[PDB]
């Protein structure tokens, strides 16, 4: 009766939202009920003035964790796509969420700067925003997440299949 | 597939949490699945240093609304027990939640002051806290909520019965 949470962490431009949306389309095509919690989407719904200092990011992460916890424990698959740049926060999330599936889209900096349709890295290079996660903002890489995908070497389709494969191995699907 | 939210609004000491807990107990004995969102509980879990200015309460209310909306659209009865002192915020909640059941525990200030086991009215009356909702902090009373109960004239049992009666007339149970 307890479902699972796919927690996709990574720096800006790693491909988190893309993978989250592809997974949603696939799982709902199979007849599953799914909720998407995207960092940018949740911020602009709930607190669009919230900034990106550490305490602010932490409060926002705590909100997303509790949202996933409540949905998951009631049978609802939840897909989270938030930067979540610190190891300690993802360990907190793993403790709050029983069936926790950490997904890390790994992508080199030089590719991430060329995969920036919103222009965050461009703004950052011009000093217009500071501490962008992935450039001058720190990102603590996961050591052994349930799934690592190299978004510079895999297609979105292969990323989806790799997550689904691990989900079946866990017995969650 | 769409469930409902019982939104219990009122000033401090009105009896919101007591009624929320009695409803939780009653509905789960009927074999229902229920999530409880209490203002004090959510605050100490998600942001215990959040204060009580209008903008701070408004953020917290938006968080609660989003959690209730996500749970209820997946078939999960949600019981909210938060002060929610302004009509504008409860109207926002009503727009965000299809099956919205507003419940107002109405209770005179004189009774509320004698029903203060946490001692908030005492702390307020000695200037220790400012703007306690129900004393000097404002509360906009609901005009035509789905259920009004007078907690100075009705037992908790009778409050539960009244809510359940309204839920069956709406077709929600
Ligand atoms: N496997 C992939 N292969 C090639 N391009 C990709 C891949 N995944 C994403 N892209 C593109 O990379 C861009 C950024 O992807 P996106 O899902 O927005 O990353 P993000 O991690 O959510 N960024 P942010 O929300 O700012 O933290 C988009 O143009 C995607 O279409
Ligand atoms: N129908 C009732 N009749 C008599 N006493 C009651 C009734 N309901 C609650 N009480 C008591 O009134 C006190 C306050 O009730 P409570 O549920 O904590 O109110 P509240 O609105 O949640 N306060 P707050 O969380 O600070 O905004 C408690 O001691 C209850 O036991
Ligand atoms: N210093 C920053 N300033 C502005 N935006 C940032 C910054 N760092 C990351 N971002 C982007 O802001 C969007 C929302 O990020 P989140 O996932 O919500 O980050 S998090 O650290 O709080 O978890 C994302 O597109 C993110 O890449
Ligand atoms: N000025 C205040 N200062 C401290 N506590 C308050 C104040 N006003 C109300 N409270 C109490 O703080 C607890 C949590 O309140 P909430 O339900 O979360 O209020 S709300 O306005 O933000 O919706 C409740 O016990 C509430 O009665
Ligand atoms: Mg994104
Ligand atoms: Mg209470």
From TrEMBL, chains A, B:
UniProt binding sites for ADP: 13-18, 154, 159
Superkingdom of source: Archaea
Any one Gene Ontology BP term: sulfate assimilation via adenylyl sulfate reduction
Biological or metabolic pathway of the protein: Sulfur metabolism; hydrogen sulfide biosynthesis; sulfite from sulfate: step 2/3
Sequence positions that bind adenosine 5'-phosphosulfate: 43, 52, 57, 60-61, 83-84, 118, 130-131, 133
Keywords of the record: ATP-binding, Kinase, Metal-binding, Nucleotide-binding, Phosphoprotein, Transferase
EC number: 2.7.1.25
Top-tier EC class: transferase
Domain APS kinase: 3-150
Protein residues bound to ATP: 10-17
Gene Ontology CC entries for this record: cytoplasm
Reactions accelerated catalytically: adenosine 5'-phosphosulfate + ATP = 3'-phosphoadenylyl sulfate + ADP + H(+)
Family (UniProt): Belongs to the APS kinase family.
Role this protein plays: Catalyzes the synthesis of activated sulfate.
Protein name as annotated: Adenylyl-sulfate kinase
Organism of derivation: Archaeoglobus fulgidus
Record gene name: cysC
């Amino acid at each position: 009766s307890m479902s699972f949470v796919i927690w996709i962490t990574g720096p800006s431009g790693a491909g988190k939202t893309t993978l989250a949306n592809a997974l949603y389309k696939k799982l709902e095509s199979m007849g599953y009920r799914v909720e998407l919690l995207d960092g940018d989407g949740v911020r602009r719904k709930l607190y669009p003035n919230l900034g990106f200092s550490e305490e602010e990011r932490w409060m926002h992460n705590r909100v997303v964790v509790e949202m996933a916890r409540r949905l998951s424990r009631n049978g609802i698959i939840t897909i989270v796509s938030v930067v979540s740049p610190y190891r300690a926060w993802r360990e907190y999330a793993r403790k709050e969420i029983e069936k926790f599936v950490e997904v890390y889209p790994r992508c080199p900096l030089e590719v991430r700067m060329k995969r920036d349709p919103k222009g965050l890295y461009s703004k950052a290079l011009r000093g217009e925003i500071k501490g962008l996660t992935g450039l001058d903002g720190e990102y603590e890489e996961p050591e052994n997440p349930e799934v690592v995908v190299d978004t510079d070497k895999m297609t979105v389709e292969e990323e989806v299949e790799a997550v689904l494969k691990k989900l079946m191995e866990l017995g969650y699907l």
